[PDB]
Structures are given as structure tokens and as C-alpha cells.
Design a protein around this motif. Structure first.
Motif, PDB file in Angstrom:
ATOM      1  N   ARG A  69       0.835  -1.172   0.000  1.00  0.00           N
ATOM      2  CA  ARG A  69       0.000   0.000   0.000  1.00  0.00           C
ATOM      3  C   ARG A  69       0.884   1.241   0.000  1.00  0.00           C
ATOM      4  NH1 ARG A  69      -2.353  -5.009   1.152  1.00  0.00           N
ATOM      5  NH2 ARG A  69      -4.397  -4.532   2.051  1.00  0.00           N
ATOM      6  N   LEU A  70       0.440   2.250  -0.758  1.00  0.00           N
ATOM      7  CA  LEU A  70       1.153   3.516  -0.876  1.00  0.00           C
ATOM      8  C   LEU A  70       0.707   4.572   0.141  1.00  0.00           C
ATOM      9  CD1 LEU A  70       1.371   4.119  -4.760  1.00  0.00           C
ATOM     10  CD2 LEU A  70       3.111   3.078  -3.296  1.00  0.00           C
ATOM     11  N   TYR A  71       1.702   5.253   0.698  1.00  0.00           N
ATOM     12  CA  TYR A  71       1.516   6.311   1.671  1.00  0.00           C
ATOM     13  C   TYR A  71       2.342   7.504   1.201  1.00  0.00           C
ATOM     14  CZ  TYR A  71      -0.837   2.738   4.211  1.00  0.00           C
ATOM     15  OH  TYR A  71      -1.728   1.739   4.546  1.00  0.00           O
ATOM     16  N   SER A  72       1.711   8.675   1.194  1.00  0.00           N
ATOM     17  CA  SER A  72       2.390   9.882   0.757  1.00  0.00           C
ATOM     18  C   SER A  72       3.415  10.188   1.836  1.00  0.00           C
ATOM     19  CB  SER A  72       1.402  11.041   0.640  1.00  0.00           C
ATOM     20  OG  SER A  72       0.266  10.653  -0.109  1.00  0.00           O
ATOM     21  N   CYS A  90       1.923   9.747   7.311  1.00  0.00           N
ATOM     22  CA  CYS A  90       0.747  10.233   8.018  1.00  0.00           C
ATOM     23  C   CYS A  90      -0.346   9.229   7.693  1.00  0.00           C
ATOM     24  CB  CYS A  90       0.423  11.613   7.477  1.00  0.00           C
ATOM     25  SG  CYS A  90      -0.992  12.336   8.284  1.00  0.00           S
ATOM     26  N   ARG A  92      -3.865   7.091   8.522  1.00  0.00           N
ATOM     27  CA  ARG A  92      -5.197   7.009   9.087  1.00  0.00           C
ATOM     28  C   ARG A  92      -5.632   5.551   9.149  1.00  0.00           C
ATOM     29  NH1 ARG A  92     -10.653   6.731   7.166  1.00  0.00           N
ATOM     30  NH2 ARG A  92      -9.561   6.120   5.243  1.00  0.00           N
ATOM     31  N   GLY A 107      -8.619  -1.946   8.220  1.00  0.00           N
ATOM     32  CA  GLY A 107      -7.683  -2.114   7.119  1.00  0.00           C
ATOM     33  C   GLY A 107      -6.425  -2.815   7.570  1.00  0.00           C
ATOM     34  N   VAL A 108      -5.922  -3.716   6.747  1.00  0.00           N
ATOM     35  CA  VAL A 108      -4.732  -4.470   7.119  1.00  0.00           C
ATOM     36  C   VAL A 108      -3.495  -3.573   7.288  1.00  0.00           C
ATOM     37  CG1 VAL A 108      -3.182  -6.325   6.488  1.00  0.00           C
ATOM     38  CG2 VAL A 108      -5.611  -6.510   5.886  1.00  0.00           C
ATOM     39  N   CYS A 109      -3.101  -2.842   6.253  1.00  0.00           N
ATOM     40  CA  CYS A 109      -1.860  -2.110   6.373  1.00  0.00           C
ATOM     41  C   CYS A 109      -1.940  -0.920   7.325  1.00  0.00           C
ATOM     42  CB  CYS A 109      -1.348  -1.650   5.026  1.00  0.00           C
ATOM     43  SG  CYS A 109       0.448  -1.296   5.107  1.00  0.00           S
ATOM     44  N   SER A 110      -3.035  -0.163   7.282  1.00  0.00           N
ATOM     45  CA  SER A 110      -3.148   0.973   8.192  1.00  0.00           C
ATOM     46  C   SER A 110      -3.177   0.563   9.674  1.00  0.00           C
ATOM     47  CB  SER A 110      -4.310   1.890   7.809  1.00  0.00           C
ATOM     48  OG  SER A 110      -5.581   1.274   7.729  1.00  0.00           O
ATOM     49  N   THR A 150      -5.506  12.808   5.629  1.00  0.00           N
ATOM     50  CA  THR A 150      -4.095  12.454   5.430  1.00  0.00           C
ATOM     51  C   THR A 150      -3.557  13.165   4.184  1.00  0.00           C
ATOM     52  OG1 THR A 150      -4.627  10.327   4.256  1.00  0.00           O
ATOM     53  CG2 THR A 150      -4.294  10.264   6.617  1.00  0.00           C
TER      54      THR A 150
HETATM   55  C1  FAD Z   1      -0.677   7.478  -3.869  1.00  0.00           C
HETATM   56  C2  FAD Z   1      -1.508   7.170  -2.662  1.00  0.00           C
HETATM   57  C3  FAD Z   1      -1.212   7.860  -1.481  1.00  0.00           C
HETATM   58  C4  FAD Z   1      -1.795   7.486  -0.274  1.00  0.00           C
HETATM   59  N1  FAD Z   1      -1.447   8.183   0.850  1.00  0.00           N
HETATM   60  C5  FAD Z   1      -2.014   7.813   2.042  1.00  0.00           C
HETATM   61  C6  FAD Z   1      -1.706   8.520   3.199  1.00  0.00           C
HETATM   62  O1  FAD Z   1      -0.865   9.419   3.227  1.00  0.00           O
HETATM   63  N2  FAD Z   1      -2.292   8.126   4.376  1.00  0.00           N
HETATM   64  C7  FAD Z   1      -3.163   7.068   4.421  1.00  0.00           C
HETATM   65  O2  FAD Z   1      -3.657   6.770   5.504  1.00  0.00           O
HETATM   66  N3  FAD Z   1      -3.489   6.364   3.281  1.00  0.00           N
HETATM   67  C8  FAD Z   1      -2.902   6.742   2.090  1.00  0.00           C
HETATM   68  N4  FAD Z   1      -3.241   6.040   0.960  1.00  0.00           N
HETATM   69  C9  FAD Z   1      -4.206   4.909   1.117  1.00  0.00           C
HETATM   70  C10 FAD Z   1      -3.436   3.624   1.402  1.00  0.00           C
HETATM   71  O3  FAD Z   1      -2.650   3.285   0.292  1.00  0.00           O
HETATM   72  C11 FAD Z   1      -4.341   2.434   1.737  1.00  0.00           C
HETATM   73  O4  FAD Z   1      -5.313   2.202   0.749  1.00  0.00           O
HETATM   74  C12 FAD Z   1      -5.108   2.619   3.044  1.00  0.00           C
HETATM   75  O5  FAD Z   1      -4.172   2.837   4.089  1.00  0.00           O
HETATM   76  C13 FAD Z   1      -5.998   1.413   3.342  1.00  0.00           C
HETATM   77  O6  FAD Z   1      -5.227   0.237   3.302  1.00  0.00           O
HETATM   78  P1  FAD Z   1      -5.450  -0.933   4.371  1.00  0.00           P
HETATM   79  O7  FAD Z   1      -4.384  -1.951   4.045  1.00  0.00           O
HETATM   80  O8  FAD Z   1      -5.395  -0.457   5.791  1.00  0.00           O
HETATM   81  O9  FAD Z   1      -6.951  -1.367   4.060  1.00  0.00           O
HETATM   82  P2  FAD Z   1      -7.300  -2.754   3.329  1.00  0.00           P
HETATM   83  O10 FAD Z   1      -7.010  -4.018   4.117  1.00  0.00           O
HETATM   84  O11 FAD Z   1      -6.682  -2.632   1.976  1.00  0.00           O
HETATM   85  O12 FAD Z   1      -8.873  -2.528   3.090  1.00  0.00           O
HETATM   86  C14 FAD Z   1      -9.244  -1.588   2.103  1.00  0.00           C
HETATM   87  C15 FAD Z   1     -10.175  -2.278   1.102  1.00  0.00           C
HETATM   88  O13 FAD Z   1     -11.292  -2.961   1.676  1.00  0.00           O
HETATM   89  C16 FAD Z   1     -12.497  -2.552   1.060  1.00  0.00           C
HETATM   90  N5  FAD Z   1     -13.097  -1.373   1.724  1.00  0.00           N
HETATM   91  C17 FAD Z   1     -12.539  -0.153   2.034  1.00  0.00           C
HETATM   92  N6  FAD Z   1     -13.436   0.673   2.611  1.00  0.00           N
HETATM   93  C18 FAD Z   1     -14.592   0.000   2.656  1.00  0.00           C
HETATM   94  C19 FAD Z   1     -15.810   0.390   3.174  1.00  0.00           C
HETATM   95  N7  FAD Z   1     -16.068   1.677   3.447  1.00  0.00           N
HETATM   96  N8  FAD Z   1     -16.819  -0.543   3.077  1.00  0.00           N
HETATM   97  C20 FAD Z   1     -16.608  -1.799   2.536  1.00  0.00           C
HETATM   98  N9  FAD Z   1     -15.374  -2.178   2.039  1.00  0.00           N
HETATM   99  C21 FAD Z   1     -14.394  -1.266   2.115  1.00  0.00           C
HETATM  100  C22 FAD Z   1     -12.024  -2.005  -0.282  1.00  0.00           C
HETATM  101  O14 FAD Z   1     -11.663  -3.015  -1.191  1.00  0.00           O
HETATM  102  C23 FAD Z   1     -10.747  -1.284   0.098  1.00  0.00           C
HETATM  103  O15 FAD Z   1      -9.923  -1.077  -1.002  1.00  0.00           O
HETATM  104  C24 FAD Z   1      -2.685   6.416  -0.237  1.00  0.00           C
HETATM  105  C25 FAD Z   1      -2.970   5.736  -1.420  1.00  0.00           C
HETATM  106  C26 FAD Z   1      -2.399   6.093  -2.651  1.00  0.00           C
HETATM  107  C27 FAD Z   1      -2.597   5.223  -3.879  1.00  0.00           C
END
Ligand code: FAD
Length: 292
Positions: A69-72, A90, A92, A107-110, A150
Motif C-alpha cells: 500500500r502507498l503512503y504519501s 501520516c 489514518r 484495514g490491514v496495512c493501516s 491524510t
Molecule cells: C498514492 C496514494 C497515497 C496514499 N497516501 C495515504 C496517506 O498518506 N495516508 C493514508 O492513511 N493512506 C494513504 N493512501 C491509502 C493507502 O494506500 C491504503 O489504501 C489505506 O491505508 C488502506 O489500506 P489498508 O491496508 O489499511 O486497508 P485494506 O485491508 O486494503 O482494506 C481496504 C479495502 O477494503 C475494502 N473497503 C474499504 N473501505 C470500505 C468500506 N467503506 N466498506 C466496505 N469495504 C471497504 C475495499 O476493497 C478497500 O480497497 C494512499 C494511497 C495512494 C494510492
């Protein structure tokens, strides 16, 4: 000259978490954390506005590594310690509820990052990516930065470069305007930094807040970033009509529709065509969007 993919998802750099602190004050909503890593063992170099990948640990159903996962990046190229040894994010925590069971899902990565203890080693990091959110070379540029949540992150980096550092070559002499949207004062990420930069650069740095649960529209509604763009539509269009002017927008995808629509509506009101303006801005590389 622009670094990218110094580390690939195949063989990421292994970083060490050296700090992890809560950014939402008491009474705020949600949890957003500032997470910093020592990178001094590898060649990770980066520019302001870029992103890094994190590979959270564990596997998926097929015994397979998770996707990055990408984070700015929230720090300048030098890192918060100004010694070129670190990088910050940063982050969330993502939560939602399943519509059939009601269960809460994190979310897994956050979740991995938000609960990452200081001292933790073996953090899988991937080489910098992005060219869309870079700061312009023009030291005289006007920089307009629209942020929700974020989305503040690359602008923290910008601003530190602009007003909190002294460089051997660069020195910003332009105007910078940040419009930042959050629900509560407690949720103003990095409030003290920005406010200090504002007090110390009163003619070059403008800080506009949109605090949705604390400030009201003339109709009595909640003030969002799009409400500020509407209130200051004339000024924004005047600014956009300078060639040295860059607009940046960063945050969750949901900030985009209503912002694009305010611009559109405020453009029609003034017999202007916002699709047009945007096209040309995009061609002049003065309009930058990183929304996720
Ligand atoms: C270029 C870029 C920059 C970013 N910068 C930041 C940053 O600075 N800070 C930051 O916190 N994140 C940032 N992100 C977001 C980050 O990459 C992840 O997507 C985010 O942290 C969630 O990942 P996760 O692994 O915690 O959630 P995951 O385990 O990946 O779960 C997310 C997924 O589950 C499902 N889901 C999500 N929301 C819901 C919902 N409301 N209801 C039902 N299903 C849902 C969707 O498939 C979603 O894609 C950025 C992303 C990009 C591409």
C-alpha cells in the motif's frame, strides 16, 4: 534526477520504526498517526510529494505476500530529523462495517502501521514513486494546496521545504495557500507547525481551515474545503489565471467530486469554462491530483 523505485516490491528495504505518535487530539475523531522510519542503512532518497510503499506482514489465502500500500511521504527529503536518515508517513486507520454481519473490519496495512511499536525492525518499504505531486522548480510559484485528512501529508513536506528549511540553492519567494478540511479542531493534523509557519510568514503563507463540525455555512450547513473554494472562487480564478500558479489536491477520492463541482458551478456563474481551464492547466502541468 527524480528518484523512483530505488526499492522494488520484490526486495524492499527493511526499515526501523523510530517513532509513532497520535495526531488527533483528545475530543477528536478517529486515529491518525505520524510514523517515522530510519532508512540510513539503504539508498532510499526521495523528493517532497512522492510516496513509499509498505508491505504489511503475513500472507493471503494462498500463502502469498500482501500487496504494498502507498503512503504519501510527510517529511522533506532530509526527513524530520534533518539528517537525511529518515522518512515519515501520516497514516489514518481504515475501519468499516460489513453490511450483512455488521462486523467491524480494520484495514490491514493501516492497522499494522498504527499499532507499529517504536523499535520494530523489518519494515518492508518500497522505493519512492510519483512525479505528479512534486513541487515546482519556479521559486516564485504560487502554490494552492487543497487537503482533507491524510491529504495534508505532502503539503507538510512542501511547507517545511518552503518555510522551515534553509537550502544551499533553493529559496521559496512565492505565495502558498493551504485550505485544509477536517471535522474538528482536534483533527487539525500538525496544527501547531502550520500555525507557527503562518505567524512567521504572514505575507507568503495563508492558512485557511474548513472545520466541518465547528463552522457553519450561511445556509447553516457544514463548512468543507469545497465551501472555501466557493467562498473564494473569485480569488482562486484570479490566481489560476497567472501562469506561475499551481493547484494541488490530496486526500480521499470523496473530496474530488464536490470540489470539481464547486469549481464547475462557480465557473458557469462567471461565464467561464472549468473543463477548459483544467485541460490547459493540465497541459501546463500546473494542476495536480493525488486522491485515493
Ligand atoms: C498514492 C496514494 C497515497 C496514499 N497516501 C495515504 C496517506 O498518506 N495516508 C493514508 O492513511 N493512506 C494513504 N493512501 C491509502 C493507502 O494506500 C491504503 O489504501 C489505506 O491505508 C488502506 O489500506 P489498508 O491496508 O489499511 O486497508 P485494506 O485491508 O486494503 O482494506 C481496504 C479495502 O477494503 C475494502 N473497503 C474499504 N473501505 C470500505 C468500506 N467503506 N466498506 C466496505 N469495504 C471497504 C475495499 O476493497 C478497500 O480497497 C494512499 C494511497 C495512494 C494510492
Amino acid at each position: 534526477s527524480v528518484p523512483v523505485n530505488i526499492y522494488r516490491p520484490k526486495t524492499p528495504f527493511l526499515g526501523k520504526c523510530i517513532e509513532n505518535y497520535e495526531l488527533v487530539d483528545e475530543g477528536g475523531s478517529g486515529t491518525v498517526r505520524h510514523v517515522t522510519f530510519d532508512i540510513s542503512e539503504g539508498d532510499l532518497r526521495y523528493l517532497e510529494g512522492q510516496s513509499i510503499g509498505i508491505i504489511p506482514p503475513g500472507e493471503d489465502k494462498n500463502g502469498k505476500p500482501h500487496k504494498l500500500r502507498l503512503y504519501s511521504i510527510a517529511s522533506t527529503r532530509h526527513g524530520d530529523m534533518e539528517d537525511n536518515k529518515t522518512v515519515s508517513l501520516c497514516v489514518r486507520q481504515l475501519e468499516y462495517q460489513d453490511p450483512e454481519s455488521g462486523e467491524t473490519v480494520y484495514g490491514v496495512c493501516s492497522t499494522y502501521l498504527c499499532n507499529l511499536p517504536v523499535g520494530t525492525d523489518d519494515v518492508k518499504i518500497t522505493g519512492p514513486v510519483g512525479k505528479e505531486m512534486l513541487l515546482p522548480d519556479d521559486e516564485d510559484a504560487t502554490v494552492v494546496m487543497l487537503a482533507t485528512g491524510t491529504g495534508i501529508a505532502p503539503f507538510r513536506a512542501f511547507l517545511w521545504r518552503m518555510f522551515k528549511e534553509q537550502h544551499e540553492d533553493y529559496k521559496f519567494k512565492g505565495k502558498a495557500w493551504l485550505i485544509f478540511g477536517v471535522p474538528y479542531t482536534a483533527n487539525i493534523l500538525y496544527k501547531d507547525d502550520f500555525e507557527k509557519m503562518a505567524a512567521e510568514n504572514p505575507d507568503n503563507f495563508r492558512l485557511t481551515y474548513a472545520i466541518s463540525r465547528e463552522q457553519k455555512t450561511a445556509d447553516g450547513g457544514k463548512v468543507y474545503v469545497q465551501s472555501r473554494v466557493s467562498e473564494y472562487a473569485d480569488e482562486l480564478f484570479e490566481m489560476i489565471q497567472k501562469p506561475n500558479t499551481h493547484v494541488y489536491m490530496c486526500g480521499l477520492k470523496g473530496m474530488q467530486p464536490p470540489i470539481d463541482e464547486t469549481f464547475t458551478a462557480e465557473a458557469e456563474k462567471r461565464g467561464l469554462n472549468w473543463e477548459e481551464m483544467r485541460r490547459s492547466m493540465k497541459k501546463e502541468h500546473r494542476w495536480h491530483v493525488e486522491v485515493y
